[PDB]
A paper describes a structure:
A single copy of SARS-CoV-2 main protease (MPro, nsp5) is encoded within large polyproteins (pp1a and pp1ab), which encompass all nonstructural proteins (nsps) 1–10 and 1–16, respectively. MPro mediates its own release, termed autoprocessing, through stepwise cleavages at its termini, accompanied by stable dimer formation and appearance of mature-like catalytic activity. Processing of the polyproteins to mature nsps is critical for virus assembly and production of viable progeny virions. The chymotrypsin-like fold of the MPro catalytic region (residues 10–185) is connected to a helical region (domain III, residues 201–306) through a long loop (residues 186–200).
Room-temperature X-ray structure of MProD48Y/ΔP168 was obtained in the inhibitor-free form at 1.85 Å resolution. MProD48Y/ΔP168 crystals are monoclinic in space group I2 and the unit cell dimensions that are different from those of MProWT, accommodating one enzyme protomer in the asymmetric unit, with the native homodimer generated through the crystallographic two-fold axis. Residue D48 is part of a short 310-helix spanning residues 46–50 (termed S2 helix henceforth) that creates a side wall for the hydrophobic substrate binding subsite S2, which D48 itself is not part of. P168 is located at the tip of a β-hairpin loop consisting of residues 167–170, that acts as a lid of subsite S4, binding hydrophobic P4 groups of substrates and inhibitors. In MProD48Y/ΔP168, the catalytic C145 and H41 and other active site residues including the deletion site ΔP168 are well ordered as indicated by the strong electron density maps. In contrast, the electron density is weak for the S2 helix where mutation D48Y is present, with high atomic displacement parameters (B-factors) for these residues. The active site in MProD48Y/ΔP168 is more open than in MProWT caused by the movements of residues belonging to subsites S2–S5. Specifically, the helix, spanning residues 46–50, shifts by as much as 3 Å from its position in MProWT away from the catalytic site, resulting in the adjacent α-helix, which is not part of the active site, containing residues 54–60 to move in unison by about 1 Å. P168 deletion in MProD48Y/ΔP168 results in the β-hairpin loop shortening and a loss of hydrophobic interactions made by P168 with A191.
Residue numbers in the entry:
A (entry chain A), B (entry chain A): 1 to 167, 169 to 306
The structure:
């Protein structure tokens, strides 16, 4: 019993973090086999943080301009190239701690773990969601660039995020092929995050977790239709609900015996009348950063190795 | 910028988790050098979950009654003994992944990371606090017994908690010398958790984190004394505040320029008037599971290796 914001165990990723220095800039890189991946803006200098030409900046570098260190060992850079917004540094030694991995691009509403790092050294792990506006509400200080986000699926690490920049309180980055999430660029412009919305299917999954854990006070006997619900949801800046979402919630409906559309009726009331000073799973707000799979994993107990 | 419930990287601990089976009972153990530590109730059977005599149960066992597996490798048990509520299983192979470690007993209000495990396999990591009533509000399903709680101090893992039982929604366990936190026993009796209170010094540390991150709406120009504050705090089930707590908050007072007693005045108002539908660091409740050190670590950026 109980319900926590739970991150994936980070051991497999900790062994891939290295420090990358170019000039006076130091940040983090990801070392898989004989390639180190890091944000390309490690080659930028003040004058260039405004309007950089990365192809120009890269052609003026050579392999020995890149100091890469895995702890105390130094890695020899034997080749470099750029793929979109990441730099791929070829090194002379393959990481012997390379896990089984793949590179995946996630969708808004999906969650992952972030291993926050400074100077190549792991500092903390936490769980977050990709927001509908393609930012994450992370926790990052200067020097955290190159920290990665990941999920663990069986024995396999799915890398889905590399941190690049902070934009007025929230955080933006790329997948591991170097393509940004959202309409952001790795330079100084007037870019801001767009309007965020609440991830409705995640709120419903969390209300199911609450029932599983004994919080039942918000239930009622009413029911509703997808279209009546989506009418009220749009008013409160909630993502609309599809039939696909209903099916995804199937397992949780089965385990609690409460139909999805029954639960939607409870959500509709919570949105119109409020919490009334009561809490749900220790929160006074409706929580939207747990997916249906997160709830199943924590309320049924899947492991990895 | 940003503020998250951040756990320690778990890699160093993942390499010490093993599976321990005795009879039909399987749970988790901690393998450091050539000793496996696990809850002693792994030797109990139904008839004994009520009123067990553990010395009797242990004398009727031999080394080959204990199946210990580190992944796929099996470990040979060459000796066993009991220290308070833990079992120490001597095995024929020293764990080569044994980190630098020590065994510490924590105080209520202190936080640590939990590596939740099933069948010896790590499943998730999360941060929690030891409550003033000596329970933790964890997330554990059947089979999680033997999962450990820890902090990382420099290069050194401080083990502080081993999970033993669930008591009506909350969780109870021992230090690694086998002594329970709180007045609990590892048998079936009528034991319940006592009344919990809110950890005041932690709430103040969190309000400082909020200011550091730009949430200032709750501040005011008033001030107060320790005794006036503690008078109102007792009314709301808050732990009283000592001069020691004030000193601990020193660094955060220095960084924000807001005196502790100034901040206490803001807390006093929040307790008497409420949140008024506004949030602090994304919460509509006063959060008490971040220590002053947690805030410094996240808002200044200490790493480990």
């Amino acid at each position: 019993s109980g319900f926590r914001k739970m991150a994936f165990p980070s051991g497999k990723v900790e062994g891939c973090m290295v420090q990358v220095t170019c000039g006076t800039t130091t940040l983090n890189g990801l070392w898989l086999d004989d390639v180190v991946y890091c944000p390309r803006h490690v080659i930028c200098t003040s004058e260039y943080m405004l309007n950089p030409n990365y192809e120009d900046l890269l052609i003026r570098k050579s392999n020995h301009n890149f100091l890469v260190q895995a702890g105390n060992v130094q890695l020899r850079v034997i080749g470099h190239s750029m793929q979109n917004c990441v730099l791929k540094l070829k090194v002379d030694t393959a990481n012997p701690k390379t896990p089984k991995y793949k590179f995946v691009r996630i969708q808004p509403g999906q969650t992952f773990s972030v291993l926050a790092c400074y100077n190549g050294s792991p500092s903390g792990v936490y769980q977050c969601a990709m927001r509908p506006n393609f930012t994450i509400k992370g926790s990052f200080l200067n020097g955290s660039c190159g920290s990665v986000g990941f999920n663990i699926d069986y024995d396999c690490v799915s890398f889905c995020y590399m941190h690049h920049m902070e934009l007025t309180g929230v955080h933006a980055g790329t997948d591991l092929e170097g393509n940004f999430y959202g309409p952001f660029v790795d330079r100084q412009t007037a870019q801001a995050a767009g309007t965020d919305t609440t991830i409705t299917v995640n709120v419903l999954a969390w209300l199911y977790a609450a029932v599983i854990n004994g919080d039942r006070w918000f239930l009622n006997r009413f029911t509703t239709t997808l279209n009546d619900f989506n009418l009220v949801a749009m008013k409160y800046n909630y993502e609309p609900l599809t039939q696909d979402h209903v099916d995804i919630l199937g397992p949780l409906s089965a385990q609690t015996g409460i139909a999805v559309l029954d639960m939607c009726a409870s959500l509709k009331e919570l949105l119109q009348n409020g919490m009334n000073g009561r809490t749900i799973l220790g929160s006074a707000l409706l929580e939207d950063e747990f997916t249906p799979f997160d709830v199943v994993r924590q309320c049924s107990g899947v492991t990895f190795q």
